[PDB]
Amino acid sequence: NFGTFS
Amino acid sequence: NFGTFS
Amino acid sequence: NFGTFS
Amino acid sequence: NFGTFS
Amino acid sequence: NFGTFS
Amino acid sequence: NFGTFS
Amino acid sequence: NFGTFS
Amino acid sequence: NFGTFS
Amino acid sequence: NFGTFS
Amino acid sequence: NFGTFS
């Protein structure tokens, strides 16, 4: 993942 | 994923 | 991962 | 990982 | 890891 | 911009 | 900008 | 900028 | 800037 | 800057 939010 | 929100 | 938030 | 937050 | 936070 | 290509 | 390409 | 390419 | 390429 | 390339 790159630049993800969880 | 790139630039995702969960 | 690069630049991710969890 | 590079530049990640957890 | 490089430049990571946990 | 977020997630754009130019 | 976040996650952009130019 | 965060996670950008130029 | 954080995690950028130029 | 943090974790940047130029």
Side-chain angles (χ1 to χ4, degrees):
Chain A
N1 281 11
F2 184 108
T4 63
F5 296 83
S6 63
Chain B
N1 281 11
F2 184 108
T4 63
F5 296 83
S6 63
Chain C
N1 281 11
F2 184 108
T4 63
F5 296 83
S6 63
Chain D
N1 281 11
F2 184 108
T4 63
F5 296 83
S6 63
Chain E
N1 281 11
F2 184 108
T4 63
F5 296 83
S6 63
Chain F
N1 281 11
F2 184 108
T4 63
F5 296 83
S6 63
Chain G
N1 281 11
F2 184 108
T4 63
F5 296 83
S6 63
Chain H
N1 281 11
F2 184 108
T4 63
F5 296 83
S6 63
Chain I
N1 281 11
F2 184 108
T4 63
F5 296 83
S6 63
Chain J
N1 281 11
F2 184 108
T4 63
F5 296 83
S6 63

